[PDB]
Amino acid sequence: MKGSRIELGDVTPHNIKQLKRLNQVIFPVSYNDKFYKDVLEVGELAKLAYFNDIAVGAVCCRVDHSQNQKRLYIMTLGCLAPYRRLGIGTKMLNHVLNICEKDGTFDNIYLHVQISNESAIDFYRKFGFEIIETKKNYYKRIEPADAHVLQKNLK
Amino acid sequence: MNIRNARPEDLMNMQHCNLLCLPENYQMKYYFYHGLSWPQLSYIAEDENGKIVGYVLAKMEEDPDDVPHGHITSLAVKRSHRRLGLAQKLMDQASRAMIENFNAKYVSLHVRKSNRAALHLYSNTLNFQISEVEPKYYADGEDAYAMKRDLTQMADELRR
Amino acid sequence: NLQILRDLSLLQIQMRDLEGYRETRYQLLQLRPAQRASWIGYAIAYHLLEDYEMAAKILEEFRKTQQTSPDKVDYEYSELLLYQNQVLREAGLYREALEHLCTYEKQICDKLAVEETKGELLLQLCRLEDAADVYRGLQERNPENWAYYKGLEKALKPANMLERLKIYEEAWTKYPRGLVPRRLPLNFLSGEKFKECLDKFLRMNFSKGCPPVFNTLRSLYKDKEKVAIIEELVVGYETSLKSCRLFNPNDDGKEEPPTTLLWVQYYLAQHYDKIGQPSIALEYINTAIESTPTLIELFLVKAKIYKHAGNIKEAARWMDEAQALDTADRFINSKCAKYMLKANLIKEAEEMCSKFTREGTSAVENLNEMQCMWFQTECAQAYKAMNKFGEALKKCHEIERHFIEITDDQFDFHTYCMRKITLRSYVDLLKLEDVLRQHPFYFKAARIAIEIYLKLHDNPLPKEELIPEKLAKVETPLEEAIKFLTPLKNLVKNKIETHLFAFEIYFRKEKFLLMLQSVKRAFAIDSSHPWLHECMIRLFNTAVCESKDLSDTVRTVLKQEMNRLFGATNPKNFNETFLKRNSDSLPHRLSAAKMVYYLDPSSQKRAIELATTLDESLTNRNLQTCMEVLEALYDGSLGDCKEAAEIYRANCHKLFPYALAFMPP
Ligand SMILES: CC(=O)SCCNC(=O)CCNC(=O)[C@H](O)C(C)(C)COP(=O)(O)OP(=O)(O)OC[C@H]1O[C@@H](n2cnc3c(N)ncnc32)[C@H](O)[C@@H]1OP(=O)(O)O
Ligand SMILES: CC(=O)SCCNC(=O)CCNC(=O)[C@H](O)C(C)(C)COP(=O)(O)OP(=O)(O)OC[C@H]1O[C@@H](n2cnc3c(N)ncnc32)[C@H](O)[C@@H]1OP(=O)(O)O
Ligand SMILES: O=P(O)(O)O[C@H]1[C@H](OP(=O)(O)O)[C@H](OP(=O)(O)O)[C@H](OP(=O)(O)O)[C@@H](OP(=O)(O)O)[C@H]1OP(=O)(O)O
């Protein structure tokens, strides 16, 4: 805990272009402008992750209402390729979980993972995520078009 | 960089560094007011060629219903000279000049709620405390943080 | 009769009649001798007349009637002693000023001004043992001031390079956060002692993550020995940092974050830009951008490489890229508009400054009200580059109108600084308002105005508003140019451009006694100036073949001081003497070639081969001179040479592969 050079920050209208530049560098899929308009209206579920005071990663979430239960869908979570294996994704994902036990009304945590990114499954598996559903034809143009559904039960 | 006490010949270059990076600008006769009322409180930073790269404009708030306290009017560093230690070293020279010239008990300022660079300076390094959130204090409707830094632990190390 | 003598002195200190001001404050003293404003107004009237040995005896008879007063303030009395100590130092009385300081040093609140004058007085009295214990106490208060290390070197007086370093080496262990004591040894060390002292400077700043590690070390780049030490050190850092995550492959510490390799590539992108190799400067900065694409400092440097290489339209593209990332920093917004104005994009730059201004007005109208002189200079320069000479004269007249505001802004401080005793800063304000227009923002605005009025004489085409079309259609362009020159001729005399701009105004008015006066002052500053040579060749030529239409008392006195300035020759052998003394400097070679065509237009082919020299033995063969040689082959200063101005453009394109001035059509 002592000596932290990793910290999080709020997505602001004055740094929203950094959030879009982080997304298109890291993820193969693209997001329209209406995605980046809703992310300014969420609050503390959208965080920019910093490392030595430069922005190297981000997390975006939204509140879901499906299957008669309150879920939280973690859409984007990742950091840059030169800055991995350094603890950025552990700090980002613990921030999402800290909101969940503080509220207590949440029922689920889920996200879709590509079946080719086997490094990302082994990161989420450590925090309690299970493979509950295998989608097919989820992504359109990418070479792996399948997608697992990784879920975490809070109750 | 040379950190030294600002003279009236340096005031016209401090307005140029203010117009260059801060959205809350002042006239020239405001600078000639801070340099003739509290000359010892305004400091600057400069390089080998003599151009100003940072400044601190500070004052003492003249109010009779309370203890004497300092006020930070402005602070900026050119982006070519940021992350050099230049602004903590400019606020440390100005807070010491409030203690030994006017016997200030604390120092206050206003900072925007989204100014992340200045929040990490005042809270994590200069140890300012958030006193009052002021709503719609600025021209684009943004809320400000009123901050306070107690100048009594710093006054004990000068007498020691 | 008060308030008729009070405001009369108030407008006398404004217009600076110090003999009529001293006679007015003398009557106020004999009418109101009890007020503290009547004594300190009478002593300032002697400090401005440089009569220090009577101003020191009015501050003494005022001081002894002040400490006994029951309404004494501790701050208004310490500022009187610190001003009385200053009159004693300007009179040369360095002995009885230290005696005056050591008596009252416990009644003065400002301990910075007490220690700095005491450290100065103990040097002029040769008391260097007690002086070095003042400068060590000043250095503990502020270890970032350069004046406290030059006072230590003047008191300890080191002999060799080894014990001179011990002044700065003590300050490293005593102040581990100071940056000044670790940077000033690099100015005088040399060889292996320089290398191992620079090595502990660069590892400290790369691991910390300071972006201005280059902007500190930029002053010691004019040396060919010291550059090759930095060039081998950081390239050795960059090689091992992407192979073992360490600065050296042999030292035993913990490994480095990926941030450290990012900041060594950031140094070697500005390093090769300073050397003049923009192909490698762009190659390093693009590798850094492909790691962290949201770091704003990587786009301010890529836009600085293209500006130095000659592509200001490509440089303004990346300043527009960097402001998109963070839209609250006014620095990357104000420098982006500065790069838009350099690319002649005035309307694109006005919508840029509209992002950070008032809602209820325009973007350029707000910056005129906020005294923004850096924006009204680049707009005045860009309108001149687009041949909008009327619009450019509007901005140069608004900068001059800013300087009329500031000299009238001192009017509410003559009464204010006598009610509050702050007499040291008030006298420094009065001396500033005499030399206010020697600021650099006035010279770069008066240069544009005179150069436009010189073109309007060669080729003619509340308060009151300024209309751009009324300004350029003026009947006396050289009489409006002399109003921009009259303050420069008084206050800015150390610059050679002040006297040479005085030549061009009087050369077009045929006033030979003033053309001789201005060329004599410019000769005593830099006699090997290329622009000065084009003035005296044009002076000697209009005294040989233009000897009939002058007065007899004028033509007799002229020829005496010419032969004092150059030997018993014609103007043609003065050009060959100038050409042979400095033939390896390219700007002098163009100034000699433009005059060997001016004296006789039949020698055109020798004039072209002089100016189009491009071998590597030349000095100042950079972009800014080769662009000036090429534009002289277009403007007719070397004759009709359209065939020769195209083989030169294709030769200069191999030297500068990024510039837009040498791009092929
Ligand atoms: C299907 C889809 O496309 S879903 C989109 C998922 N997001 C992305 O793909 C973007 C980035 N992808 C990644 O996989 C990133 O590496 C992320 C998300 C793991 C970033 O998190 P990181 O910064 O790497 O956290 P970090 O690795 O430091 O800590 C997590 C711990 O889990 C372990 N771990 C993490 N990755 C791995 C891995 N490939 N293999 C084995 N163990 C791992 C480590 O033990 C690590 O501990 P450590 O820091 O002491 O080494
Ligand atoms: C006017 C007022 O009273 S408040 C408004 C002040 N700001 C403005 O007007 C806009 C211009 N902003 C600036 O010029 C600068 O960013 C300033 C004044 C905020 C400070 O910048 P610097 O000159 O780099 O200050 P400095 O390096 O001494 O700050 C030290 C600490 O401040 C923090 N800090 C400084 N800059 C940053 C930054 N960009 N991001 C995050 N933290 C920062 C850090 O915690 C740093 O600690 P460290 O030295 O251990 O790394
Ligand atoms: O913005 P200013 O305070 O007026 O200083 C600028 C600026 O220097 P800074 O970046 O430190 O502020 C220029 O840098 P850029 O405009 O290229 O970003 C620099 O130019 P160089 O670093 O390339 O040398 C120099 O310009 P100049 O070379 O003319 O001195 C100077 O400009 P002025 O002092 O003349 O205004």
Domain extents in chain A: 1-155
In chain B, the number of structural domains is 1
Q: Specify whether the CB–CB gap between C178 and C143 falls below 8 A.
A: yes
Q: For residue C76, which of C419, C428, C426 has the smallest C-alpha distance?
A: C419
Residue C626 vs residues C281, C386, C603, C614, C621: alpha-carbon distances, Å: 21, 21, 22, 9, 7
Q: What is the resolution of this structure in A?
A: 3.0
CA of A93 to the centre of ligand 1 (A): 11
C330: nearest CB among B21, B82, B93? B21
Task: Encode chain A in three state secondary structure.
Answer: CCCCCEEEEECCCCCHHHHHHHHHHHCCCCCCHHHHHHCCCCCCCCEEEEECCEEEEEEEEEEEEECCEEEEEEEEEEECHHHCCCCHHHHHHHHHHHHHHHHCCCCEEEEEEECCCHHHHHHHHHHCCEEEEEECCCCCCCCCCCEEEEEEECC
Pairing verdict, β B106-112 and B69-77 = parallel
> C48: how many CB neighbours lie within 10 A of its CB?
17
Please indicate whether, in this complex, the C-beta atoms of C257 and A52 are within 8 angstroms of each other.
Answer: yes
Q: Which two tokens stand for residue C581?
A: 């003394």
At B76, is the secondary structure helix, strand, or coil?
A: strand
Q: Specify whether the CB–CB gap between A6 and A91 falls below 8 A.
A: yes
Question: Where in the sequence is the domain holding B71, given as residue range(s)?
Answer: 1-160
Please indicate whether, in this complex, the C-beta atoms of A14 and B83 are within 8 angstroms of each other.
Answer: no
Question: Residue B78: closest CA among chain C residues belongs to which residue?
Answer: C331
Q: Which residues pair with A65 in a beta bridge?
A: A70
* Positive/negative CA dihedral, C290, C295, C300, C301: negative
The verdict on the CB of residue B80 being under 6 Å from ligand 3 is: yes
Query: How far is A100 from A112, CA to CA, in rounded Å?
Result: 19
CA of A136 to the centre of ligand 1 (A): 24
Determine contact: A53 vs chain B, CB below 8 A: yes
Sheet containing strand A147-153, strands side by side: A6-10, A47-51, A54-66, A69-79, A108-114, A147-153, A130-135
Tell me the CB-side half-sphere exposure of residue C614, using CA atoms within 13 A: 17
At B113, is the secondary structure helix, strand, or coil?
A: coil
Query: How far is C576 from C571, CA to CA, in rounded Å?
Result: 9
Chain C contact probe: residue of B60, B79, B89 with most C CBs at under 10 A:
B79
First to last CA, chain B: 29
Question: Residue B83: closest CA among chain A residues belongs to which residue?
Answer: A53
Tell me which amino acid residue C161 is. Answer: M
Task: Looking at the CA of residue A114, tell me the nearest atom of ligand 1.
Answer: 1
Residues of A serving a catalytic function are: 73, 112
Q: Which uninterrupted H or E stretch holds C419?
A: helix C416-419
The verdict on the CB of residue B78 being under 6 Å from ligand 3 is: yes
Which residues from C are below 8 Å from A51, CB to CB? 257, 259
Q: Specify whether the CB–CB gap between B56 and B92 falls below 8 A.
A: no
Q: Which two tokens stand for residue C516?
A: 């001789």
Apex CA C153: angle with CA C150 and CA C156, to 5°?
A: 145
Non-local (6+) Cβ contacts of B47 within 8 A are: B1, B2, B53, B81, C215, C219
Query: How far is C658 from C308, CA to CA, in rounded Å?
Result: 9
Q: Specify whether the CB–CB gap between C531 and C591 falls below 8 A.
A: yes
Q: Specify whether the CB–CB gap between C407 and C436 falls below 8 A.
A: yes
DSSP C619: B
Determine contact: B1 vs chain C, CB below 8 A: yes
The protein residue with its alpha carbon nearest to ligand 1, atom 7, reads A78
Determine contact: B25 vs chain C, CB below 8 A: yes
- Length of chain B (residues): 160
Which residues from A are below 8 Å from B114, CB to CB? 10, 12, 14
First to last CA, chain C: 79
> What φ, ψ does residue C457 adopt, rounded to 5°?
-95, -35
> What φ, ψ does residue B70 adopt, rounded to 5°?
-90, 165
Q: Which two tokens stand for residue C567?
A: 């030997």
The protein residue with its alpha carbon nearest to ligand 3, atom 21, reads C304
Tokens 């592969």 appear where?
Answer: C657
Task: Encode C518-548 in three state secondary structure.
Answer: HHHHHHCCCCCCHHHHHHHHHHHHHHHCCCC
Residues A99-107: contacts with CB under 8 Å, at least 24 apart: A99/A44, A99/A45, A100/A72, A100/A154, A101/A154, A105/A70, A106/A70, A106/A71, A106/A72, A106/A154, A107/A69, A107/A70, A107/A71, A107/A154, A107/A155
Homologous superfamily in CATH for domain A1-155: Gcn5-related N-acetyltransferase (GNAT) (3.40.630.30)
Please indicate whether, in this complex, the C-beta atoms of C331 and B20 are within 8 angstroms of each other.
Answer: yes
CA of C127 to the centre of ligand 1 (A): 67
The protein residue with its alpha carbon nearest to ligand 1, atom 35, reads A123
Sheet containing strand B2-5, strands side by side: B2-5, B43-46, B52-61, B69-77, B106-112, B144-150, B129-134
Tell me which amino acid residue C346 is. Answer: I
C119 CB burial (10 A radius; 0-12, 13-18, 19+): buried
Query: How far is B12 from B54, CA to CA, in rounded Å?
Result: 13
Query: How far is C514 from C507, CA to CA, in rounded Å?
Result: 9
* Positive/negative CA dihedral, B111, B114, B118, B124: positive
CA of B86 to the centre of ligand 2 (A): 8
DSSP C557: H
Query: How far is B47 from B80, CA to CA, in rounded Å?
Result: 12
Q: Which two tokens stand for residue C455?
A: 């073109």
Please indicate whether, in this complex, the C-beta atoms of A10 and B83 are within 8 angstroms of each other.
Answer: no
Q: Calculate the CA dihedral of residues C76, C82, C87, C90 and round it to 10 degrees.
A: -150
Q: Which uninterrupted H or E stretch holds C84?
A: helix C74-90
Question: Residue B99: closest CA among chain C residues belongs to which residue?
Answer: C109
Residue A39 vs residues A18, A56, A79, A97, C427: alpha-carbon distances, Å: 13, 18, 18, 18, 57
Residue A151 vs residues A61, A109, A118, A121, B65: alpha-carbon distances, Å: 15, 6, 16, 12, 61
Residue C341 vs residues B16, C364, C377, C663: alpha-carbon distances, Å: 18, 13, 10, 21
Q: For residue A44, which of A8, A88, A89 has the smallest C-alpha distance?
A: A8
Put simply, the chain B residues between 69 and 108 with a CB less than 8 A from any chain C CB are 78-85, 89, 93, 96-97, 100-102
Q: Which two tokens stand for residue A130?
A: 């299970």
Query: How far is C439 from C495, CA to CA, in rounded Å?
Result: 13
The verdict on the CB of residue B49 being under 6 Å from ligand 3 is: no
Chain A contact probe: residue of B82, B84, B112, B114 with most A CBs at under 10 A:
B114
The verdict on whether residue A124 carries a ligand-binding annotation is yes
Pairing verdict, β B129-134 and B144-150 = antiparallel
Q: Specify whether the CB–CB gap between B97 and B72 falls below 8 A.
A: no
Q: What is the radius of gyration, based on Cα positions, of chain C?
A: 31
At B115, is the secondary structure helix, strand, or coil?
A: coil
Size of interface A-B (CB pairs under 8 A): 5
At C585, is the secondary structure helix, strand, or coil?
A: strand
Task: Looking at the CA of residue C215, tell me the nearest atom of ligand 3.
Answer: 11
Question: Residue C208: closest CA among chain A residues belongs to which residue?
Answer: A52
The torsion region of residue C3 among left (phi > 0), alpha (psi -120 to 50) and beta comes to left
Which residues from A are below 8 Å from C325, CB to CB? 15, 17-18, 21
Q: Which two tokens stand for residue B155?
A: 């006054």
What experimental approach yielded this model? cryo-EM
Put simply, the chain A residues between 51 and 110 with a CB less than 8 A from any chain C CB are 51-56, 80, 82-83, 86
Question: Residue B40: closest CA among chain C residues belongs to which residue?
Answer: C110
Query: How far is B128 from B106, CA to CA, in rounded Å?
Result: 10
Tell me which amino acid residue A134 is. Answer: T
Please indicate whether, in this complex, the C-beta atoms of A22 and C257 are within 8 angstroms of each other.
Answer: no
Please indicate whether, in this complex, the C-beta atoms of B114 and A53 are within 8 angstroms of each other.
Answer: no
Shortest distance between the Cα of B148 and any Cα of chain C, in A, equals 23
> What φ, ψ does residue C578 adopt, rounded to 5°?
-70, -35
First to last CA, chain A: 29
* Positive/negative CA dihedral, C478, C479, C480, C486: positive
Tell me which amino acid residue C177 is. Answer: R
Non-local (6+) Cβ contacts of C330 within 8 A are: B20, B21, B22, B23, C356
A3 CB burial (10 A radius; 0-12, 13-18, 19+): exposed
Q: Which two tokens stand for residue C623?
A: 């972009």
Query: How far is C120 from C113, CA to CA, in rounded Å?
Result: 11
Non-local (6+) Cβ contacts of C619 within 8 A are: C584, C585, C586
Query: How far is C631 from C611, CA to CA, in rounded Å?
Result: 11
Letter string b/e over residues C576-597, b meaning 16 or more CB atoms within 10 A of that residue's CB: eebbeeebebbbbbbbbbbbbb
Please indicate whether, in this complex, the C-beta atoms of A21 and C294 are within 8 angstroms of each other.
Answer: yes
Nearest ligand for residue C374 CA: 3
Q: Which residues pair with C152 in a beta bridge?
A: none
CA of A90 to the centre of ligand 1 (A): 8
Chain A contact probe: residue of C294, C295, C320 with most A CBs at under 10 A:
C294
Please indicate whether, in this complex, the C-beta atoms of B3 and C405 are within 8 angstroms of each other.
Answer: no
Nearest ligand for residue A124 CA: 1
Non-local (6+) Cβ contacts of B59 within 8 A are: B34, B37, B38, B41, B70, B71, B73
Residues C312-321: contacts with CB under 8 Å, at least 24 apart: C312/C339, C312/C342, C312/C343, C312/C660, C313/C343, C313/C660, C314/C658, C315/C339, C315/C342, C315/C343, C316/C340, C316/C342, C316/C343, C316/C345
Largest CA distance in chain B: 46
Non-local (6+) Cβ contacts of C225 within 8 A are: C190
Apex CA C107: angle with CA C104 and CA C108, to 5°?
A: 95
DSSP C221: G
> What φ, ψ does residue A106 adopt, rounded to 5°?
-75, 150
Query: How far is B159 from C570, CA to CA, in rounded Å?
Result: 77
Query: How far is A147 from A130, CA to CA, in rounded Å?
Result: 13
Pairing verdict, β A6-10 and B2-5 = unpaired
B58: domain CATH number is 3.40.630.30
Q: For residue A52, which of A10, A98, A6 has the smallest C-alpha distance?
A: A6
The torsion region of residue B133 among left (phi > 0), alpha (psi -120 to 50) and beta comes to beta
The verdict on whether residue A50 carries a ligand-binding annotation is no
> B92: how many CB neighbours lie within 10 A of its CB?
17
The verdict on whether residue A16 carries a ligand-binding annotation is no
Q: Which two tokens stand for residue C393?
A: 């004269």
> B23: how many CB neighbours lie within 10 A of its CB?
17
Please indicate whether, in this complex, the C-beta atoms of A10 and B114 are within 8 angstroms of each other.
Answer: yes
CA of C335 to the centre of ligand 3 (A): 10
Nearest ligand for residue C303 CA: 3
Largest CA distance in chain A: 46
Nearest ligand for residue A123 CA: 1
CA of C440 to the centre of ligand 2 (A): 29
Residue A60 vs residues C30, C46, C626: alpha-carbon distances, Å: 79, 72, 54
Q: Which two tokens stand for residue C212?
A: 């201005």
Q: For residue A120, which of A19, A22, A27 has the smallest C-alpha distance?
A: A27
Task: Looking at the CA of residue A119, tell me the nearest atom of ligand 1.
Answer: 39
Shortest distance between the Cα of B13 and any Cα of chain A, in A, equals 28
Q: Calculate the CA dihedral of residues A102, A103, A107, A111 and round it to 10 degrees.
A: -70
Q: Which residues pair with C454 in a beta bridge?
A: none
> C143: how many CB neighbours lie within 10 A of its CB?
19
Q: Which two tokens stand for residue C638?
A: 């070397």
Tell me which residues have their CB closer than 6 angstroms to ligand 1: A 26, 77-79, 84-90, 113-114, 117, 119-120, 122-123, 126, 147
CA of B156 to the centre of ligand 2 (A): 26
Please indicate whether, in this complex, the C-beta atoms of B83 and C209 are within 8 angstroms of each other.
Answer: yes
Q: Which two tokens stand for residue B160?
A: 């020691």
> What φ, ψ does residue A117 adopt, rounded to 5°?
-80, 80
